[model samples]
Target: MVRRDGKFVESKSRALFVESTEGALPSESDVVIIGGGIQGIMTAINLAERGMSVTILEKGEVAGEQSGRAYSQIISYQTSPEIFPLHHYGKILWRGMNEKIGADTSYRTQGRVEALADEKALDRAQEWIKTAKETAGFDVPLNTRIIKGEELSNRLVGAQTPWTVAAFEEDSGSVDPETGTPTLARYAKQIGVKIYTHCAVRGIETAGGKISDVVTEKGAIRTSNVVLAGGIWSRLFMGNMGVDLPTLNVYLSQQRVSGVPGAPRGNVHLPNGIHFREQADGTYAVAPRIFTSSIVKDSFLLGPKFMHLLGGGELPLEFSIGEDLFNSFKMPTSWKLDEKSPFEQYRIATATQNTEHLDAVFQRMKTEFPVFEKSQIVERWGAVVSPTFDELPIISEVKEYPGLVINTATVWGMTEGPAAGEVTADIVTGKKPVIDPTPFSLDRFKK
Candidate 1:
C-alpha cells in the first residue's frame, strides 16, 4: 500500500510488496503476461474475458511501479497525435471500469485546464488543436477548447500565473493512483486472471521462432503467447531476447499536500510547469511537468534515437548521472534463466526522488498558487517512466517473434492502459481492434 503519513519520503529500493502468496504456480497458460502493472493486468482482463487462459507474473505487487506512483490525471492533451485515439478510447473505459468490474477505480471526469505562459505557447496550443482536428477519425471533444482573459480567470480563481491563453477539457479527469491498480488487479482476479506477486520473470524461451515458455523465479510456465508489459524493464527484458526496443527512463517526483484553502476541483497545469490535481479528499497532488532522465547505459546506447527531441524546446530535459544510472549500469543485460536474474536482485524498480528539481517546482507552486501557501506536505514519491523513442506507446505484436506482444506504456499509462490493453488483446486474439492499430505497430520503429 502507498504511504500517506506525514514526513514520508519516497526513496530508492523500497519494497512496496512485503508479502507473497504460497501456491502452486501454473505451469501452462494460453497467455503469459509479465509485469503486473496496469498494462499487464488490464490486458489479462481483456484476454480472460475472451476465454483465453491468462496468467500475470509480477516482479513486485501490482501497480508497484509507475502505475501506482503516477499523478493519475486522465487526459491526452500533452500526448502525441498518434496516441490521441487511444487516449480518447481509454477515457470511456476508465469511466466504465468500476461498473463493469465491480471495482472502485476512483475515476472521475472533473475536467482539466492548462494555462499558457506566452504567445508562443498559445501558438503551440492552437497548432495542437488544428492538427488534432485534422487527424482523420479522431474527434477533438466538444468540451475541449481555448479560453483566455476573463474566461481563463473565471476558471482559475486563485491562480497567480498570468496567462494569456489556456486549454480547457471538460471531459478530462483523474483516478486514485494509490487504489486504482490494486482495484484493477482484484477485478481481474475475480474474473479468473491469475496473478503471481513477487514472481520475477528471468527470461523467455522461444522455439521455431515462437514463444514456448516464460522462465520465472518460481518455475517456467509453458505458453504460446507472452506479452512484455514490463514497464521500465521492458527494454532490458526484450534486449535479452535479441530485440532492440528503443526506450528511455524518465524520473519524476510528486508531492501530495493537504490543507489548501481553496484548491481547484479540476486538474490544473500552470504556465510555470507545475501541475496539480485535487484528490478525493480535497488535498492535491502536485508535480513539475518537466521531468528528468537518468544517464544510464541506455543513455549512451540509445541516446541517438531520442536526439530529435533536442532543441525542440517543447520537451525540456535535464540529464542526471544519479544512483539510477549506476543501478542500471550494474544490472546485467543478459542472464541465464537457470540463475538469479536482474529482476530478483531488485524486486521493485524504484528510484529516489529527484529532490533538486521537485523542490524548485514546489517553490514556484507556492508563489503561483497562493492558496497552496497554507498547504502541508502529506507524502512524496518518485516514478520512472518507460517511453518509446517516438513517445508513442507500442501495443503490437513483434512480427520477428511470434506470440510476443509489447504493451509498454508512455508516462500516461494510467490514462491509456484500458485502450492499450484492449488493443494488445485484439492483436493477440486476432480480433478487430477498437481503433486502428497500424500507428502503434512495432514495425513503426523499424523505420
Candidate 2:
C-alpha cells in the first residue's frame, strides 16, 4: 500500500514496489522464463532455491502488467477441487510471503465475505460450496460457510438488499499485488534468478519439435526449457510462433478511492455492486465485483474455442464488449522475428476508463452502502487480463516441444501463483507434481 517509488504506483496504485532497481540479463541459463509477473517470479524462486540457472525476460518493469494491476484477493474457494488444492497451498505461502520474500509485501488474511443479492446469487454460492465439499472431496471450512439475513448484514455495512444471503470466509484475505510481486522478484534474485527488464522476447526457435532457443529484442539465448507467463500477451506471443493458444485478452478497469470511514475492514462483494476492500492507507481499492471487459478481434477469433467458459457466464463477472475493439488491429499476432515485433511495440499498455460504468457503480454504492457515495476517486486505470476458455490456466508442457512449457493466462494468478509456480517447477524438473496438473493441460483446448 505504501512505497517509496512512484512508478510502482503503475497507475491507480495497481502495482506497488519498493524496487524498480533492475537486474542484469544473463547471456544464457538452464531455464528461461518469459514475463516478470508474479507467477514467473514464483517459478523462478522455486528453481533458484535448488540452484538452477534461470533468466527472466521482461518487456517492461517487473510486475508492470496484469500481475501488478490484479486485485490481490486470496480465497480458498474455487470451482474446481483440482484447483483449490493450489489455493489451499497458495494461502499458506501467502501468509508467510514476507518472511519468504525478505520484504514486507503487505500480505494478510483479514477475512472476506461474498454477499448474495438474491436467490440466484444464493444458488450460485451454494453450488460452489457443494462442489468444494462434496464433488471436490474436501471439507469446507466452518468460516467459509453460508450466513443469512442479519448474520450477514452485521458483517457488512449498509442498508440491506435482496442480496442478503452470502457465504463468508474468515480465511480469505488480500495482499498488495504491486508490492507483493516485486518482493517476490527481489527474493528470487537473492537466491539468484536473473531478471532482465526491457527485454522483450520476439520468437522461439524450435527444432526437432523442441525448444532450441529463445530469440529476444536484445539477442537470442540458447536454452532447453522456456516458460511463458506473459499474462494477456501470452496468446499473441505464442500465435506468431505457430502455436495455438486459445486465450482472449480482456481489459478491466479499477480505481483506488479515499478510504470510506466506517467501511468494514474485510473484502466485501455485493453481487450487484463494486468489489471493495479497505487498504492499509485506510482508503479502498474498488472495482466492479465482476470485471467488465472490452471486446477485441481476439474476442471473436477465440470465441468458438472458448465455449466451455463463454457459454456459462457463471461468475458474477461475465465477458462483454466495450470500447476495446480497435486495439486488436493495433497489435498483430504475426510479425517477423527479425523485426521489432508487437511485443516490443508497447512496453506498458495505457487505457482510458469508461466513466459510464463508474457512474453506475457509484450510484449503486450510494443506494446500498452510502459510505461510498461521497468517497472521492483517487486514481483510476485499466489493464489487460487473460482468462482461458475454461477460466483455468493452461499449465502444461507442450508435447510437441519437449523443452517448451506454457503456464500463463490465469484469473487467480496472484492467489494461486506460488502453488502454480511450485507445480511448474515440478513439471520442468520432471518431478511428480504437487497438484494434479492434468486438468490444466494445454491439450484440453483442442478436440
Candidate 3:
C-alpha cells in the first residue's frame, strides 16, 4: 500500500496503480468538488449516477488523509442516538456498495464487541445497548452476559488480569478503509468523474453570493457549485470563503501486531477502552482511548476567560468543556491545527507522538491473548479526524453561499461517508435528500 506522506518515502510494494491525468482542464462542468477523501469521491459518484458531470481536486493522493488513515471500525449501534436513522441508512448503503460500484472493497460486517472492565461502566453500557437496539432500532444484539473473574481468567488462559464484563455487538463491524475508499474513488472515475490528484484548491471565488469558480494551485477552474470535503483542512478552506466554520483536527493512533495463529475469533474492548480487532493479515489492530494535554491545549474553545463574580470575589468565567470532549481526549486524542505535526514537531518516529498508552494496551492484549502477546508488531500509524463542536457532522450547504456544501465531523466518517455523499449530491442537484439536512446544516452553528 502507498504509505501516507509518500512525498518523502517510496513504498517497496506497488499497491496503488497510479493513473495519468489528461493535464488538460475541462472547459466547463456542472460541479467541482475539492478534496479526494471518501466523502468527496462518494459525492462525485452520487452526482455522476444522476447523469451530472463532476470533477474532484485533491491536494494529495485519493484517501491519503484521514480517509486512508482511519481504523475502519464501523460502530453502527453506538453512534449518536439522534443520528441512528442516518446510521441505519448508511449501513444499508454499505452492505451493497460493492455491487453498485462493481468492486470488492473488502468490506466486512463481522460484528464488534464493547467490553467493559467495571460494573459501573457495564451498567451504563447496558442501558445504552438496550436503548440503541430497542428505541433506536440499531439492530445491535446485546449478547452480553456477566463472566466471573475465574471464567475471564480461563478465557485469557495465561493473562495477568481478569475481564469481568464483555458485550458483543452483532451488527457492528469493520472494513478495510484503504480498500473501501479507493474502491469508491475508482468507481467514481469509471462513472465519468474526473479526479485530479495533487491539485490543491486555493479558494472559492464568489459573486452575487454564489460560487462563480474555484481558485486552485494549478489555475482557476470555473464552476457553479463546490463541495468542501477537505477533512481537517476544511476549516482553512471554508474560512477563505468568509465563513468561520468551527472545526478542529484530532489525532488518532493505531498499532498492529502479528496474530498468534489462533487468537480469539471476535474483537475485544478492554475495560480501559483498549480496542482490538483481528485483521485479514492475521494481525491484531489495537488502540487506546486517551487524549493528551498537548492536543487539548489547541482546542477551539481555548480563549481568554471572562471575569465573573464568584464567592464575593471576581473569578475567571469558566468554560465547560463537555464530557464528550474529555472522552475524546481519553482515547483517540486529536491535535490542533496550529500545533506542529506530532511526528515532525515532537520528533516522534511513528505516525503520532503519543503511543505510550497504545504500547501498554498492546502489552495487555498480548497478556490476554497468547497469540497476540508473542507476535511481533507489523505496523503502527496515526491520522487526524476533523470533529465539530456538537460531535455531529456538518453536511449541508452554506446558507450565505448555497454553492458550497461541507461534510465532516462524523467521527465514524468512514461508515457514514457514502450515505452522506449521496445526500450531498442530492442537495447539489436540487433533489429531495434521503435524510433531512436541517439538523446537519451550517445554520445550526449560527443559531
Candidate 4:
C-alpha cells in the first residue's frame, strides 16, 4: 500500500505555504493573475512594487500545489547556455528577497556538487564546464572545478559508490521552496497585492482584440492585464481559445526522511537515478527519478508533435499509460464559459506512485549512502513535472490578445520563478528587461 500524508491530501499541501487572511474578492484591479502558485505570487510582487494594482486569484490556497511541492537546488549554472543569464539574475534576486520581503526564505549558499559514476559522465561535466567558461558573460556566481580521487571522497561523506570525479558548483545554493513561496505571497500582500483563495478564474473576456477582464468563480474582475501562471493548467486554460500549448506533466516520486543526521550535504545528483539533499527543516528530500505523463484523450490533440519522443530509444521521459490514461480521458481539455473547468474538478493533482521504482532507489540509497540506512521515513509522495516540447518555458505577450501575457512551462519553478516574474512585469510595464526575452518568448513556438 502507498504511504500517504493526510495533510497533503486533505488540505492540498497548504501546510507548506502561508495562511492567507483576505477573503472578499475585488471587483476590479489593474492586473488580474490566474493561479496563486510561485509564478503568480512572484509576478504580483514585482507588479505591486511597481505601483500597479495587482490581485492574485488562487483556485485553492496559495502554493497548495506545484509551488509547495517544489524542491529547489538553487544555482545559476545549467547545460543550456541561454539559461545561464536567467540563473545568474535569479540568484541575485533570491539573495535579496529576505531583506526586500521581510521573510527569511532560509536561502543558503551550500555549493551544489555532482558526483560522476564513470569517466564518460566526468568527460561530459568537463565539457559543460568548458562551455560555461566560454559563455561567462553574466554576473552568475559560478565556480566550477573537478574534485577527483581522494578529495572527492572527502567532500562527499558516506558516498562509497565508486564515484570517479565530481563536478562542483562552488557558488551554488539552495532555498526552502515551501517557505520561499509563502514569503513572496506575504510580501506581495504587504506591498498592496490583493490575494483571494478559492477564487478560481474560469476564462478571460476580450474586447476589440484586447483583454477586458477575467471571469472568476467569485465574479468578473475588470483588468487590462491577465497572466496565466497556472503551472500545469496553462494548456487547458488556453485550450478553449484554440491555442496550441504543447505541454505535458511528467510524474515523479519523492521520499522524505528524518534521522539521517550525517548524510551528504547540499544537492547531490547520482548517476542513473536519485537526487538527494538535506533540508533546513532537519530532514531530507529524496527523489529516485524524473516523471512523464501518459496518453490522455486530450493528448491526441497534441497529435504527432510528441511522437518523436518515442523513437529516441530510451526516451527523454517514460511514456506509459498508467493512471493518466483513464483520468486524462475524463478531464475535458476545453470547456464552455458557463461550464465547470477541469481546475475546479481537482484542487490538487494527486500523483500515482511508482512503488517498484522507488524501492530500487531506496536500495541504492542503502548501498551508496549507508549513513541513511537508519532513516525514519517521514512520507512518500509524488509530484508532476511540466516540460514543454523544447523544455524551455514561454514567457512573453500573446500575439493575438493584447494586454495578455503567459508565464508558464518553466523547467524549475523555484529557480526560474523570480526571473520569469521580472520578465513578465518588464514586458507589461514596458521597462528595459534584465535580460533578452527573445529566447523565452511565446513567438518561438509560432513556426
Q: Which model scores highest in lDDT? A: 1
**Candidate 2 lDDT tens digits, 224-297:** 98998887778888788778887766556676777767666778877666577766566677776444445568
What lDDT would candidate 3 get against the real structure? 0.64
lDDT of 1 by residue, 252-365 (tens): 777788856566667888866678888766678888766566666777887777777632356766655545566567779899999998787666665567666667777787
lDDT of 4 by residue, 1-447 (tens): 322211112236633555554666777899989888888988888898889999888888787777776667777655587777677677778877788877687777777778777778778888888888767654453577788777777667888677768888876767766677877788788889888886678899897988888887667888888988988788888887778677866666677677466787778877767677677787777777655455566557664665555224366355565555665666676776676776776677646656766677777777788887898677676666666767578788888788888998886778878888998898888798877888888788787
For lDDT, candidate 1 versus 4, the one ahead is 1
Candidate no. 3 TM-score = 0.79
What TM-score would each prediction reach against the true structure?
Answer: 0.91, 0.88, 0.79, 0.92
By TM-score, the best candidate is: 4
Note each model's CA RMSD in angstroms.
Answer: 4.5, 5.3, 8.4, 3.2
Q: Provide the clashing-pair count of each candidate structure.
A: 0, 5, 10, 3
Determine the backbone clash count of candidate 1. 0
lDDT of each: 0.78, 0.73, 0.64, 0.74
Which sections of candidate 2 miss by over 4 Å?
Answer: 1-14, 17-24, 123-127, 134-142, 149-151, 160-164, 290-295, 307-330
Ranking by TM-score: 4, 1, 2, 3
Model 3 over residues 107-129: C-alpha lDDT tens digits? 76665655566778778777766
Order the candidates by lDDT, highest first: 1, 4, 2, 3
Off by over 4 Å in 1: 1-22, 130-141, 310-314, 322-327
